[PDB]
Amino acid sequence: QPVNDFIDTATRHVLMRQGVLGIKVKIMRDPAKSRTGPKALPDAVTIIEPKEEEPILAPSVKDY
Amino acid sequence: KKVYTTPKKIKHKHKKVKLAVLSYYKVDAEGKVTKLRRECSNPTCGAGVFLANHKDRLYCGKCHSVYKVNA
RNA sequence: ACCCACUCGGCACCUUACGAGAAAUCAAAGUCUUUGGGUUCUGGGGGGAGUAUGGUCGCAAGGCUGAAACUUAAAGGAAUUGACGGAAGGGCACCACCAGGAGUGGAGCCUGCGGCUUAAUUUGACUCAACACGGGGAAACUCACCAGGUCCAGACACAAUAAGGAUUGACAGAUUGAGAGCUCUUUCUUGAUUUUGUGGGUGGUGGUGCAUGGCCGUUCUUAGUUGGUGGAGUGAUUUGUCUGCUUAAUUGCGAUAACGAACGAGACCUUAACCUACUAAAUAGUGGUGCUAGCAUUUGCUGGUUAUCCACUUCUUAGAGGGACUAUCGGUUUCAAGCCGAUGGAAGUUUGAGGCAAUAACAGGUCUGUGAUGCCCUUAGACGUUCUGGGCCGCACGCGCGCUACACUGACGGAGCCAGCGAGUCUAACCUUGGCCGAGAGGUCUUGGUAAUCUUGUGAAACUCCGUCGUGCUGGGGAUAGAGCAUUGUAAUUAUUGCUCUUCAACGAGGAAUUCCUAGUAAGCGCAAGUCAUCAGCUUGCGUUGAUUACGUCCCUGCCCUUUGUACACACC
Numbered sequence: 194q195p196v197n198d199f200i201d202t203a204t205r206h207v208l209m210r211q212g213v214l215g216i217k218v219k220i221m222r223d224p225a226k227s228r229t230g231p232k233a234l235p236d237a238v239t240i241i242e243p244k245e246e247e248p249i250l251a252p253s254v255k256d257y
Numbered sequence: 258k259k260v261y262t263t264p265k266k267i268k269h270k271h272k273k274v275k276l277a278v279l280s281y282y283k284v285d286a287e288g289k290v291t292k293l294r295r296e297c298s299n300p301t302c303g304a305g306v307f308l309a310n311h312k313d314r315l316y317c318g319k320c321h322s323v324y325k326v327n328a
Numbered sequence: 329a330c331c332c333a334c335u336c337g338g339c340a341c342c343u344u345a346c347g348a349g350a351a352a353u354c355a356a357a358g359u360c361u362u363u364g365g366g367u368u369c370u371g372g373g374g375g376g377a378g379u380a381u382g383g384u385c386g387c388a389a390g391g392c393u394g395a396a397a398c399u400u401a402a403a404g405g406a407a408u409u410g411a412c413g414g415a416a417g418g419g420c421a422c423c424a425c426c427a428g429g430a431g432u433g434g435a436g437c438c439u440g441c442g443g444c445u446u447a448a449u450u451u452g453a454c455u456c457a458a459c460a461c462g463g464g465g466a467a468a469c470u471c472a473c474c475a476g477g478u479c480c481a482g483a484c485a486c487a488a489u490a491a492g493g494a495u496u497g498a499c500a501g502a503u504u505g506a507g508a509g510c511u512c513u514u515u516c517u518u519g520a521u522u523u524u525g526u527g528g529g530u531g532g533u534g535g536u537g538c539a540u541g542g543c544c545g546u547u548c549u550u551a552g553u554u555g556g557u558g559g560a561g562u563g564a565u566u567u568g569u570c571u572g573c574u575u576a577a578u579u580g581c582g583a584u585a586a587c588g589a590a591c592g593a594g595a596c597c598u599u600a601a602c603c604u605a606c607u608a609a610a611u612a613g614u615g616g617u618g619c620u621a622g623c624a625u626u627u628g629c630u631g632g633u634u635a636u637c638c639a640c641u642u643c644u645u646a647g648a649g650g651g652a653c654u655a656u657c658g659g660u661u662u663c664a665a666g667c668c669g670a671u672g673g674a675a676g677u678u679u680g681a682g683g684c685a686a687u688a689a690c691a692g693g694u695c696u697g698u699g700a701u702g703c704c705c706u707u708a709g710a711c712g713u714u715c716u717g718g719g720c721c722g723c724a725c726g727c728g729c730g731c732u733a734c735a736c737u738g739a740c741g742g743a744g745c746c747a748g749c750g751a752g753u754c755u756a757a758c759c760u761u762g763g764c765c766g767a768g769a770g771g772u773c774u775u776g777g778u779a780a781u782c783u784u785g786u787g788a789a790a791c792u793c794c795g796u797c798g799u800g801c802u803g804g805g806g807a808u809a810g811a812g813c814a815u816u817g818u819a820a821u822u823a824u825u826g827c828u829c830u831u832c833a834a835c836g837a838g839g840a841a842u843u844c845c846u847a848g849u850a851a852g853c854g855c856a857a858g859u860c861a862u863c864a865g866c867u868u869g870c871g872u873u874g875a876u877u878a879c880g881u882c883c884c885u886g887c888c889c890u891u892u893g894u895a896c897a898c899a900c901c
């Protein structure tokens with residue numbers, strides 16, 4: 194499917210003196226910018242990256 | 258393929274003859290003019306066009322054929 | 329005799345390589361542009377050619393010595409990637425087999441291909457990957473074929489003719505298949521729109537698919553493709569991408585000079601499954617209520633009622649979510665990837681089925697889908713086009729996809745009576761309910777429907793029930809044929825289709841062969857759509873009834889992947 198969402202195809206027969214050649218062009222647009230669609234490949238599995246912890250600090254509690 | 262045959266006799270076309278036509282018209286000695294060939298009584302051809310003369314036949318050609326006035 | 333250490337001198341092998349090489353490799357092929365221990369011998373692009381000539385040896389065959397003219401841009405070496413092999417090793421699959429199913433092969437006809445036949449019987453395609461294929465079910469059309477008849481719809485430029493008419497049309501007759509003025513007789517008409525000539529265009533289902541685009545089939549029911557940084561190699565290149573194990577998968581685990589990635593596979597998308605959870609609906613349905621019928625009466629039971637109202641969303645529809653991740657546990661396994669089993673589960677075979685699908689290859693098919701196209705052919709007695717009729721169906725026969733059967737798990741007659749995917753009429757005649765008439769096919773009057781609204785609950789067929797038939801080519805079977813009635817269409821003869829009566833063949837389960845298939849599958853069974861004015865024994869889908877047998881293998885066949893040989897690279901055509 195991502196085909197459908199992302200790559201643009203076209204054929205165009207250019208008709209020269211000798212014979213005729215076909216032109217086939219294929220453009221793959223950045224899934225990042227996709228605007229109104231899926232924003233990425235169904236392959237795309239990002240991990241969000243944790244955070245250094247400075248733990249311990251024996252119990253205690255604050256009041257308000 | 259095959260090319261050519263024929264029992265001869267190839268067809269022609271048409272000629273439209275020649276003539277110097279509209280002498281058909283007679284004006285007496287200065288200069289009263291009398292029309293030969295009676296004209297046409299169909300309002301599509303206001304009496305300018307003429308009837309040809311065959312047998313029975315008096316025929317408006319301007320009418321590409323139409324109508325048979327016989328006198 | 330044997331063991332252990334040593335040492336000369338032998339035949340070798342091993343690993344390394346400071347080193348050497350164009351490499352393969354080499355303790356010499358090392359100590360060579362940092363070029364000299366001594367010495368012998370041979371070579372100087374290939375072919376001509378170890379030829380000719382001489383000499384010399386020999387019994388001989390022949391040996392040693394040994395040229396040139398001419399010809400020619402490569403011959404050649406080692407290694408690399410490929411492609412191929414009638415080598416070797418591993419795998420993968422019901423277009424392979426195993427265990428079986430249903431058959432095809434035999435018959436009748438249907439249908440395509442050949443062949444013959446023909447005025448023509450238009451043509452493409454010929455192993456899988458030509459032959460119910462070109463959506464190819466051709467009565468006209470289509471249509472290209474044949475027998476003939478018209479028309480230019482021959483742009484444009486020049487020239488020529490020519491307003492004393494360049495050209496156009498035609499009534500009747502003749503003529504013609506024809507109410508074509510095609511042509512001719514006759515003689516009006518038209519008015520510079522044509523005509524004629526040359527150049528130049530134009531059309532063509534004419535050629536070329538071995539000139540092309542595009543598409544498509546095949547390889548492929550396959551698992552392959554590449555780059556970053558690192559290791560090797562002067563180098564093209566390799567390693568990564570691999571013994572093994574696992575998987576449908578270069579799917580993974582694992583081993584590991586590799587590490588870590590991308591295309592492709594997967595993911596993804598579509599459809600069939602599950603939601604008493606969510607938003608709802610007189611174009612979907614349920615319960616209650618009235619209005620109401622029938623039967624029973626003691627409350628009951630069975631229907632009627634596009635709105636007489638109330639409510640609801642289980643069933644139907646489709647939005648949004650959820651759900652499965654092979655989960656739990658257990659066996660098995662390098663206790664790795666996995667695999668197998670049990671419970672749970674709508675679902676646990678890639679969940680079932682599809683859609684998409686990398687790099688490359690083929691002289692695969694398609695110029696006959698295209699106003700996609702090169703070049704060739706042809707272009708007015710046309711290979712343009714249209715009109716009339718015939719033809720593609722022609723029948724001693726070979727082949728292929730099918731259809732209907734040989735019956736008693738059946739035919740026939742009643743009777744029960746149940747699906748799902750579809751499709752339907754505007755500037756129109758599509759889907760058809762209902763009422764009559766008709767044995768039937770059909771007709772005729774009306775009617776709803778541009779459709780979740782009407783056809784339609786598509787009351788489909790197999791199938792289930794009670795009968796008749798009773799193994800007899802029988803009431804199985806319905807080929808072939810006659811006579812009549814009807815529908816489509818301008819047209820039905822060579823019989824479009826449908827009905828009625830009659831006629832009642834072959835075929836008693838099919839030789840060698842050979843196809844398809846693993847679950848709601850196979851097989852049986854009908855329906856809708858495509859085609860379509862009329863015609864399905866075809867196809868695309870659909871649903872109904874619903875098995876036996878695998879859950880393995882490499883034996884046959886087919887194809888991958890290594891290894892390997894290569895003098896092939898236009899690559900074994």
Ligand SMILES: [Mg+2]
Nearest residue numbers: 347348349561
């Ligand atoms: Mg070296």
Ligand SMILES: [Mg+2]
Nearest residue numbers: 405406407895
């Ligand atoms: Mg070599």
Ligand SMILES: [Mg+2]
Nearest residue numbers: 425426427428
């Ligand atoms: Mg078998």
Ligand SMILES: [Mg+2]
Nearest residue numbers: 431432433842
């Ligand atoms: Mg058999």
Ligand SMILES: [Mg+2]
Nearest residue numbers: 468469715716
């Ligand atoms: Mg015709």
Ligand SMILES: [Mg+2]
Nearest residue numbers: 482525526528
């Ligand atoms: Mg010309």
Ligand SMILES: [Mg+2]
Nearest residue numbers: 526527528529
């Ligand atoms: Mg010319």
Ligand SMILES: [Mg+2]
Nearest residue numbers: 532533695698
């Ligand atoms: Mg054409």
Ligand SMILES: [Mg+2]
Nearest residue numbers: 537691692693
């Ligand atoms: Mg080709």
Ligand SMILES: [Mg+2]
Nearest residue numbers: 537543693694
């Ligand atoms: Mg092609």
Ligand SMILES: [Mg+2]
Nearest residue numbers: 452536537538
């Ligand atoms: Mg050809």
Ligand SMILES: [Mg+2]
Nearest residue numbers: 421422423549
């Ligand atoms: Mg299979």
Ligand SMILES: [Mg+2]
Nearest residue numbers: 560561562563
């Ligand atoms: Mg290097």
Ligand SMILES: [Mg+2]
Nearest residue numbers: 569570578890
């Ligand atoms: Mg490899």
Ligand SMILES: [Mg+2]
Nearest residue numbers: 604641642643
């Ligand atoms: Mg519901």
Ligand SMILES: [Mg+2]
Nearest residue numbers: 670671672673
């Ligand atoms: Mg269970």
